[PDB]
Design a protein around this motif. Structure first.
Motif, PDB file in Angstrom:
ATOM      1  N   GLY A   1       0.813  -1.177   0.000  1.00 36.07           N
ATOM      2  CA  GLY A   1       0.000   0.000   0.000  1.00 36.07           C
ATOM      3  C   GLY A   1       0.863   1.249   0.000  1.00 36.07           C
ATOM      4  O   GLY A   1       1.827   1.351  -0.755  1.00 36.07           O
ATOM      5  N   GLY A   2       0.476   2.191   0.841  1.00 37.36           N
ATOM      6  CA  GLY A   2       1.159   3.457   0.962  1.00 37.36           C
ATOM      7  C   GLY A   2       0.745   4.438  -0.107  1.00 37.36           C
ATOM      8  O   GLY A   2      -0.097   5.300   0.143  1.00 37.36           O
ATOM      9  N   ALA A   3       1.319   4.339  -1.299  1.00 36.13           N
ATOM     10  CA  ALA A   3       0.868   5.164  -2.414  1.00 36.13           C
ATOM     11  C   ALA A   3       1.015   4.435  -3.747  1.00 36.13           C
ATOM     12  O   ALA A   3       1.488   5.012  -4.728  1.00 36.13           O
ATOM     13  N   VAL A   4       0.634   3.160  -3.809  1.00 29.84           N
ATOM     14  CA  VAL A   4       0.678   2.442  -5.076  1.00 29.84           C
ATOM     15  C   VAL A   4      -0.299   3.073  -6.059  1.00 29.84           C
ATOM     16  O   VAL A   4      -1.434   3.405  -5.697  1.00 29.84           O
ATOM     17  N   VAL A   5       0.125   3.245  -7.318  1.00 32.62           N
ATOM     18  CA  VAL A   5      -0.706   3.957  -8.294  1.00 32.62           C
ATOM     19  C   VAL A   5      -1.066   3.111  -9.522  1.00 32.62           C
ATOM     20  O   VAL A   5      -2.251   2.917  -9.807  1.00 32.62           O
ATOM     21  N   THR A   6      -0.073   2.618 -10.262  1.00 36.10           N
ATOM     22  CA  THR A   6      -0.229   1.585 -11.303  1.00 36.10           C
ATOM     23  C   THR A   6      -1.392   1.853 -12.270  1.00 36.10           C
ATOM     24  O   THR A   6      -2.455   1.253 -12.188  1.00 36.10           O
ATOM     25  N   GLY A   7      -1.172   2.798 -13.184  1.00 37.90           N
ATOM     26  CA  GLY A   7      -2.062   3.008 -14.307  1.00 37.90           C
ATOM     27  C   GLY A   7      -1.396   2.821 -15.667  1.00 37.90           C
ATOM     28  O   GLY A   7      -0.217   2.489 -15.767  1.00 37.90           O
ATOM     29  N   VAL A   8      -2.199   3.016 -16.719  1.00 34.91           N
ATOM     30  CA  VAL A   8      -1.651   3.120 -18.075  1.00 34.91           C
ATOM     31  C   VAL A   8      -1.147   4.531 -18.323  1.00 34.91           C
ATOM     32  O   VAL A   8      -0.207   4.737 -19.094  1.00 34.91           O
ATOM     33  N   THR A   9      -1.755   5.513 -17.674  1.00 33.10           N
ATOM     34  CA  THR A   9      -1.252   6.876 -17.663  1.00 33.10           C
ATOM     35  C   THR A   9      -1.088   7.291 -16.209  1.00 33.10           C
ATOM     36  O   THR A   9      -1.575   8.343 -15.792  1.00 33.10           O
ATOM     37  N   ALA A  10      -0.433   6.434 -15.431  1.00 30.01           N
ATOM     38  CA  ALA A  10      -0.239   6.673 -14.011  1.00 30.01           C
ATOM     39  C   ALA A  10       0.411   8.019 -13.763  1.00 30.01           C
ATOM     40  O   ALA A  10       1.420   8.358 -14.378  1.00 30.01           O
ATOM     41  N   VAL A  11      -0.173   8.788 -12.852  1.00 26.83           N
ATOM     42  CA  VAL A  11       0.352  10.091 -12.472  1.00 26.83           C
ATOM     43  C   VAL A  11       0.188  10.248 -10.969  1.00 26.83           C
ATOM     44  O   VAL A  11      -0.887   9.985 -10.425  1.00 26.83           O
ATOM     45  N   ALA A  12       1.259  10.648 -10.300  1.00 21.74           N
ATOM     46  CA  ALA A  12       1.223  11.007  -8.898  1.00 21.74           C
ATOM     47  C   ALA A  12       1.858  12.374  -8.745  1.00 21.74           C
ATOM     48  O   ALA A  12       2.760  12.738  -9.496  1.00 21.74           O
ATOM     49  N   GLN A  13       1.376  13.137  -7.773  1.00 21.93           N
ATOM     50  CA  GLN A  13       1.907  14.475  -7.560  1.00 21.93           C
ATOM     51  C   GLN A  13       1.626  14.887  -6.125  1.00 21.93           C
ATOM     52  O   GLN A  13       0.489  14.778  -5.664  1.00 21.93           O
ATOM     53  N   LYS A  14       2.665  15.341  -5.427  1.00 17.78           N
ATOM     54  CA  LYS A  14       2.535  15.903  -4.088  1.00 17.78           C
ATOM     55  C   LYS A  14       1.939  14.892  -3.113  1.00 17.78           C
ATOM     56  O   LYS A  14       0.976  15.173  -2.403  1.00 17.78           O
ATOM     57  N   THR A  15       2.546  13.709  -3.065  1.00 16.17           N
ATOM     58  CA  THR A  15       2.052  12.638  -2.206  1.00 16.17           C
ATOM     59  C   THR A  15       2.098  13.007  -0.725  1.00 16.17           C
ATOM     60  O   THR A  15       1.346  12.437   0.068  1.00 16.17           O
ATOM     61  N   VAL A  16       2.965  13.938  -0.336  1.00 14.53           N
ATOM     62  CA  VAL A  16       3.022  14.464   1.021  1.00 14.53           C
ATOM     63  C   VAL A  16       3.302  15.952   0.923  1.00 14.53           C
ATOM     64  O   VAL A  16       4.304  16.356   0.326  1.00 14.53           O
ATOM     65  N   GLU A  17       2.430  16.770   1.497  1.00 17.54           N
ATOM     66  CA  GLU A  17       2.625  18.215   1.508  1.00 17.54           C
ATOM     67  C   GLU A  17       2.405  18.758   2.913  1.00 17.54           C
ATOM     68  O   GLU A  17       1.688  19.735   3.135  1.00 17.54           O
ATOM     69  N   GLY A  18       3.035  18.111   3.882  1.00 15.75           N
ATOM     70  CA  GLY A  18       2.975  18.542   5.262  1.00 15.75           C
ATOM     71  C   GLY A  18       3.774  17.585   6.113  1.00 15.75           C
ATOM     72  O   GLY A  18       4.327  16.600   5.622  1.00 15.75           O
ATOM     73  N   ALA A  19       3.818  17.880   7.407  1.00 16.92           N
ATOM     74  CA  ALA A  19       4.538  16.984   8.299  1.00 16.92           C
ATOM     75  C   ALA A  19       3.725  15.718   8.520  1.00 16.92           C
ATOM     76  O   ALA A  19       3.226  15.477   9.623  1.00 16.92           O
ATOM     77  N   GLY A  20       3.606  14.896   7.481  1.00 13.29           N
ATOM     78  CA  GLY A  20       2.812  13.686   7.557  1.00 13.29           C
ATOM     79  C   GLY A  20       3.542  12.536   6.912  1.00 13.29           C
ATOM     80  O   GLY A  20       4.429  12.735   6.080  1.00 13.29           O
ATOM     81  N   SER A  21       3.158  11.325   7.290  1.00 12.50           N
ATOM     82  CA  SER A  21       3.874  10.125   6.895  1.00 12.50           C
ATOM     83  C   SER A  21       2.949   9.151   6.179  1.00 12.50           C
ATOM     84  O   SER A  21       1.742   9.124   6.421  1.00 12.50           O
ATOM     85  N   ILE A  22       3.532   8.354   5.289  1.00  8.63           N
ATOM     86  CA  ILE A  22       2.817   7.279   4.619  1.00  8.63           C
ATOM     87  C   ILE A  22       3.561   5.984   4.877  1.00  8.63           C
ATOM     88  O   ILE A  22       3.612   5.099   4.019  1.00  8.63           O
ATOM     89  N   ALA A  23       4.153   5.864   6.052  1.00 11.51           N
ATOM     90  CA  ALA A  23       5.089   4.779   6.310  1.00 11.51           C
ATOM     91  C   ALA A  23       4.336   3.456   6.380  1.00 11.51           C
ATOM     92  O   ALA A  23       3.852   3.056   7.439  1.00 11.51           O
ATOM     93  N   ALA A  24       4.251   2.761   5.245  1.00 13.81           N
ATOM     94  CA  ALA A  24       3.697   1.412   5.212  1.00 13.81           C
ATOM     95  C   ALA A  24       4.771   0.442   5.697  1.00 13.81           C
ATOM     96  O   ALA A  24       5.425  -0.265   4.927  1.00 13.81           O
ATOM     97  N   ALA A  25       4.940   0.416   7.011  1.00 14.64           N
ATOM     98  CA  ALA A  25       6.032  -0.290   7.664  1.00 14.64           C
ATOM     99  C   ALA A  25       5.456  -1.409   8.512  1.00 14.64           C
ATOM    100  O   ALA A  25       4.793  -1.144   9.515  1.00 14.64           O
TER     101      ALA A  25
END
Lengths: 61, 61, 61, 61, 61, 61
Positions: free
Chosen positions: B32-56
């Motif tokens: 998980g965390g930020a898996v995207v997986t498209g044919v036109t996959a686009v990600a932008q600004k996955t973190v814009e603050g003191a925050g975590s996506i730690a899939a740990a």
């Protein structure tokens, strides 16, 4: 600001996450958080504050 | 600022994450965390603050 | 600033992450953080603050 | 007897007969007889008797 | 006898007969006889007797 | 005897006969006889006797 995504595909095919196991004794599967998986998958600003998406199992036997 | 993504594909095919196991005793799968997986996959600004996506996981036996 | 991505492919094929194991005793698989995996995969500004995406297992037996 | 024709092409393109003229005074165009023009063009036994396919103009001014 | 034609094409494109003229005074166009023009064009035994397919104009001015 | 035609195409495109003229004074166009023009065009035994398909104009001015 602007974020323009344009696609003119023809016959697209997508698989996202895929897990497989066999003959295991003890299985634990955890998926999520921000899975998106499209043909025109788009994610933006998944976190915009002091917040977490920690999809963290924590197997503590 | 501007971010322009243009695609004119024809017959695209995508696989994302793929896990396989066999004859294991104790399986633990975490995705998980930020898996995207498209044919036109686009990600932008996955973190814009003191925050975590730690899939740990934290397997602590 | 500007970021222009243009693609005019024909018959593209993508595999992302792929894990395989066999005859193992104790399997632990952790994936994520910022996996993107597209045919026109684009990532930008994955961290724009004092924030972490540390997909760090921490196997402590 | 046997006549086996097998083809496993991919992206074939064929032009057959093509006539072009310009600034002519008196044009006479005659085509035919046994034109075939395929991607897997096959002809067999075009004449099997006392017969003719004489595509013969005979311009007699 | 046997006549086996097998084709497994993908994206074929065929043009047959094509005539073009310009600035002519007197045009005469005659086509036919046994034109076939396919993607898997097949002809067989176009004449099996004392017979004719003479696509013969005979311009006699 | 046997005549087996098998085709497994994908996206075929066919043009047959095509005539074009310009600025002509006196145009005469004659087409036919045994034109077939398919994607799996097949002809067989177009004449099986003392018979004719003579698509013959005979412009006699």
């Amino acid at each position: 600001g602007v974020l323009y995504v344009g696609s003119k595909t023809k016959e697209g095919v997508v698989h996202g996450v895929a897990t497989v196991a066999e003959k295991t004794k003890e299985q634990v599967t955890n998926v999520g958080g921000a899975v998106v998986t499209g043909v025109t998958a788009v994610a933006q600003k998944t976190v915009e504050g002091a917040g977490s998406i920690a999809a963290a199992t924590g197997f503590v036997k």
